[PDB]
Amino acid sequence: LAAALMQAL
Ligand SMILES: *C(=O)c1ccc(-c2ccc(C(=O)OCC)cn2)nc1
Ligand SMILES: *NNC(=O)c1ccc(-c2ccc(C(N)=O)cn2)nc1
Numbered sequence: 001l002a003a004a005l006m007q008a009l
């Protein structure tokens with residue numbers, strides 16, 4: 001999940 005959201009970065 002963290003990665004899925006942090007892809008913006
Ligand atoms: C959320 O964005 C998220 C959580 C966990 C994972 C993930 C990807 C790959 C592995 C892996 O290769 O584990 C080997 C033990 C684990 N967790 N991706 C995205
Ligand atoms: N928000 N994330 C990014 O902007 C981002 C773009 C690209 C990459 C990345 C990481 C690793 C590789 C590789 N070939 O191992 C390529 N691109 N990370 C983050």
Ligand SMILES: Cc1cccc(C)c1
Nearest residue numbers: 003004006007008009
């Ligand atoms: C998806 C992603 C972007 C930036 C940094 C990390 C660790 C993960």
Ligand SMILES: Cc1ccccc1C
Nearest residue numbers: 001002003004006007
């Ligand atoms: C499996 C994974 C997830 C998020 C960022 C980098 C990598 C190698």
Ligand SMILES: Cc1ccccc1C
Nearest residue numbers: 001002003004006007
């Ligand atoms: C999540 C991950 C896995 C393997 C190498 C680098 C990174 C950021």
